[PDB]
C-alpha cells in the first residue's frame, strides 16, 4: 500500500540528531548493540515457544545473520526473533518516550561514553553513528511483514512491504551507511567487530560473504 | 495480485517429464546452461545499451550470481540481464512450441547425450534433472517483476511479484532441489562444476557463502 508517517516523540529526534551528528571515535560499538538487541529477540520467541511450541514453525531456526551489500552500501543484520507488529514498530521505535533517552543525553553532557547507551536501553539509536538512514523490516507471527524507515528527520514512515524477500520471522535491520563508514562492508573488520564486542552470544552468528569464482 | 495459470504446450511437457524422471549420470550440466542463458540475457542488455545507455541505469553492474539456500534446500542463480516481462515470460517459458523441444527428443531417442540439449536451445530444461521445482523470478525495465513457477505438470503459474526482494533488472531462477541432489548447495562443488564447464565467461560469476562467525 501508501505509507504512513508519524512523528518521533521530542526526546527521541533530539537524541538521534545528537548522535548522526557527533565526531566520537569509537563508532563500531553500534554492531555490539545490534547483536544483542538481535539476541533479545531471539530469547523472547524463545521463552515464549516453551509454552507455544508452533510458535517457531514459521522460522525453525535460531540466527543472527549479517549481510553487507558493497554495491547499495548497505549492510544488514537480520535475526528470526520474535519480531514486531505494525503497532509495536510504531510504539517501541518512535511515538513512545524511551525510559532512559533524556537521562541518556544528560549523562552524555556530563562526561559519558557513548558506549553505555545500551544500559540505558535506547541501544538502537547508535545505529545513526554509521547509518545516516535505516530501514527495519519486521514479521511478527501476529501481522504481516512492515517497513519502518527514518533518516533520523524528526518524523517516520511505516509501509507495509511488497518490496522485500519474505521473512518467515524477525527482523531485518537495513544500514545505509555514510561515505566514511564503509569498511564495515568488510569481512575482516565484521569479524573483528565480533570477536572484541559479543564473546558470549548464545545464537549463531553468520556472515554472508560474496566472492567471485576463479 | 492473484496467479494465472497457463497450459504448456504439449511438446514442453513431454520434454520435461522425461527429463525429470531420466536417471542419466551427468545432472551437472544443467549449471552450465543455466549460466549460458545467463550469459546471453547480459550480451543482450549490452548490446541494447550501446544505442540506449538509459537501459544499463536500473542495474549499472553486470553479473551472475549463485546463491545456496541450504535450509530451503534451493539454489539461485540470478543475472543482471534483459530480464522478462509477463508476455516474454509466458511465451518463452512456455506457449510457445520451442524449436528443437521434439527434434531434442528425437535425437535422445537414438543415443544423444543429454549434455547436447542446449545445442536444441531448450537449455533451459535441464534443471530438471536436479530440482522437482522452480520459480523464474524477473523484471525487465519494459514490465513490472513477475514470478513464473512450474512442477514439471502440464500446467504453470505466472504471478504479479509482491513477495521476493527487488531485482533492480535482471531474472532469478530459484531451483527446489531434489533430496538426492542437495550436494549442489556446497561451494567446493558448485566452483567445481563451474571451473569444468563455464571457463569462458564474459562476466563475473559471483558465489555467496553463509559462514558462522569463530
Ligand atoms: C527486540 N525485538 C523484539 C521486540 C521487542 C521490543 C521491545 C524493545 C524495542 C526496542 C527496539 C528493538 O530492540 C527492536 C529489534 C531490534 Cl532494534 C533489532 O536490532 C533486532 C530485533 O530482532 C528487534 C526485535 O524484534
Ligand atoms: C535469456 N534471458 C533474456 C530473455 C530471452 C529470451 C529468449 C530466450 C528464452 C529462453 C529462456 C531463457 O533463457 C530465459 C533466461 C534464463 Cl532461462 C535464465 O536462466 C537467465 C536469464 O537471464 C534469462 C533471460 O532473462
Known sequence: ???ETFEFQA?????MSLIINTVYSNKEIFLRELISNASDALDKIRYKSLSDPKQLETEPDLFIRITPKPEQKVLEIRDSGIGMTKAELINNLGTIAKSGTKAFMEALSAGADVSMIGQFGVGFYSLFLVADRVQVISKSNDDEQYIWESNAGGSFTVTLDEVNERIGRGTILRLFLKDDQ???LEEKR????IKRHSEFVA??????VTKEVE
Chains 1, 2 share one sequence.
Open 203 to 208: 545464537y549463531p552468528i553468520q556472515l554472508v
Open 182 to 184: 564503509l569498511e564495515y
Open 11 to 15: 526526546e527521541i529526534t533530539q537524541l
Open 190 to 193: 565484521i569479524k573483528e567487530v
Open 1 to 3: 500500500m501508501a505509507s
